[PDB]
């Protein structure tokens, strides 16, 4: 029946789940779990940023500084284009 | 962008079957279709002009020159405003308050869905549940396999 | 649709065995059966006409011209209204308060 | 029930309260001996 040698079989998730997951990553990026400086402006159209216990300093009154840290710990999308909210764009690397 | 403090062509309606818990509403394809639907409701009362009360303490109401018993079936309000042109604003009636024998305070809450129905723009959002296409043109089932977690 | 602020044919009843925790109630097959059931309850008091107070602060009450001791068994109220025709409205008695 | 749908010509505050009652669970008694669970309670 023609079976000899070795076979390489490549497999991938179904279209239903590719659509689900791709759309999710597009909007919200990837799980990172790294302590590092955040990617704020690395994509063409928008960057999603969510931290935990972020460190932010500046010559800024501490009440507002605390508020800014809360914003990033809760997650925010930074838009680099005037077409805010349009997720149809590719949003390729800058 | 902000709801006005005064109204014109005001109508208090009976028999509007949705509420401020916002679990159900009647959806429309145009503001004119929307208007026609509301226009078909029985009018408990009308006023050509009125100034609203209570906006600051966020419990808005309108003074209505009717005995309270004439308003027991009031359920909804619609009005226009001199500065918003043709636009209709829509609100739930939430309470009737006796002020005196000939005057009633009708409390209302802006229906944000009906009022802003054609002003909102949905962008791509995480969908938890929705109704989807069930069958292909050849009569085969569409493929929907996300684990429902139901027995 | 709204509960009226005045009542007619008012009756304060004793011995109605369910409460405003709404875990139990007596279910009926018709408004007439319902009326008959409540009408068969002992009456602590009756009034042909009354105006309600406190609808404003959602603490409704009625002034009753009886010494409080004659009302210690009060548990329920039923009333009609001139503009609701034959309809009966029903209410839990929740508290007694001394006026004089 | 859970998320029950109830309509009627009723002020919306009371209608919302009625929906909460059934979403919380209630026993409807068809007999006057309310609370007497010793009865058979057969199909009607």
């Amino acid at each position: 029946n023609g079976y000899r040698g070795v076979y390489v079989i490549k497999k991938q998730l179904k279209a239903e789940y590719r659509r689900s997951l791709s759309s999710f990553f597009h909007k919200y990026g990837y799980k990172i779990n790294r302590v590092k400086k955040p990617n704020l402006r690395t994509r063409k159209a928008f960057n999603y940023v969510q931290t935990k216990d972020c460190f932010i300093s500046g010559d800024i009154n501490n009440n507002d500084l605390q508020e800014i840290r809360t914003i990033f710990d809760n997650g925010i999308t930074l838009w680099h284009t005037d077409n805010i909210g349009n997720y149809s764009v590719e949003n390729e690397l800058r | 962008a902000y709801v006005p403090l005064s109204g014109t062509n005001v109508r208090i309606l009976a028999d509007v079957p949705f509420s401020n818990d916002y679990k159900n509403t009647r959806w429309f394809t145009s503001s004119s279709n929307q208007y026609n639907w509301f226009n078909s409701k029985s009018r408990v009362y009308e006023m050509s002009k009125v100034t609203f009360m209570g906006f600051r303490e966020n419990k808005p109401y309108v003074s209505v020159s009717l005995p309270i018993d004439k308003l027991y079936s009031a359920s909804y309000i619609m009005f226009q405003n001199a500065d918003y042109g043709n636009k209709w604003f829509y609100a739930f009636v939430t309470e009737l308050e006796f002020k005196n024998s000939a005057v009633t305070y009708v409390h209302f809450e802006i229906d944000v869905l009906q009022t802003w129905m054609f002003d909102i723009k949905f962008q791509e959002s995480f969908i938890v549940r929705e109704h989807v296409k069930l069958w292909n043109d050849d009569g085969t089932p569409t493929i929907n396999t996300i684990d429902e977690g139901l027995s």
Side-chain angles (χ1 to χ4, degrees), chain B residues 44-86:
Chain B
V44 178
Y45 190 61
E46 319 173 34
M47 299 172 281
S48 61
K49 294 178 181 176
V50 66
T51 301
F52 304 135
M53 300 290 292
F55 269 58
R56 185 59 188 87
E57 69 270 5
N58 208 41
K59 296 180 188 294
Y61 62 95
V62 55
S63 219
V64 175
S65 286
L66 279 184
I68 189 160
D69 69 281
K70 294 294 190 63
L71 293 159
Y72 283 153
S73 69
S75 68
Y76 214 76
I77 307 178
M78 58 192 288
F79 62 93
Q80 294 179 312
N81 172 264
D83 306 301
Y84 263 95
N86 204 22

Side-chain angles (χ1 to χ4, degrees), chain B residues 93-146:
Chain B
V93 171
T94 58
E95 178 162 336
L96 307 173
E97 167 174 13
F98 180 90
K99 183 184 181 193
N100 62 61
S101 60
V103 179
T104 302
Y105 285 153
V106 181
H107 294 254
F108 65 87
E109 169 185 342
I110 296 295
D111 180 337
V112 295
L113 280 181
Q114 292 293 331
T115 292
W116 301 117
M117 182 174 293
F118 303 97
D119 308 284
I120 57 166
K121 174 152 181 47
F122 254 103
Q123 298 284 6
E124 297 83 343
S125 307
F126 189 93
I127 310 301
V128 183
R129 307 197 73 88
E130 73 191 342
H131 280 95
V132 305
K133 182 190 184 192
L134 299 184
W135 309 101
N136 298 306
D137 297 325
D138 61 1
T140 60
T142 54
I143 296 182
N144 292 284
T145 67
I146 288 145

Side-chain angles (χ1 to χ4, degrees), chain B residues 28-43:
Chain B
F28 300 106
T29 61
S30 75
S31 58
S32 65
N33 284 344
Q34 180 182 45
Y35 171 79
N36 291 334
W37 191 86
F38 285 108
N39 197 32
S40 71
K41 299 294 176 168
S42 298
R43 294 160 188 194

Side-chain angles (χ1 to χ4, degrees), chain A residues 10-60:
Chain A
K10 298 182 186 193
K11 301 178 176 181
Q12 59 187 31
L13 76 181
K14 305 287 188 176
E16 178 185 14
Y17 292 94
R18 175 182 308 281
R19 270 190 291 280
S20 170
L21 297 175
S22 195
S23 70
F24 187 84
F25 298 151
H26 183 73
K27 181 164 179 174
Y28 295 113
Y30 301 159
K31 261 187 203 171
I32 305 302
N33 294 346
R34 271 183 73 190
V35 173
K36 59 185 286 287
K37 296 187 185 183
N39 292 349
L40 301 176
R41 196 180 183 268
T42 59
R43 301 300 194 81
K44 181 68 167 58
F46 60 92
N47 279 87
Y48 182 73
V49 186
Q50 186 198 330
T51 56
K52 199 175 182 294
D53 186 42
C54 65
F55 189 113
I56 305 180
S57 60
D59 195 17
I60 300 162

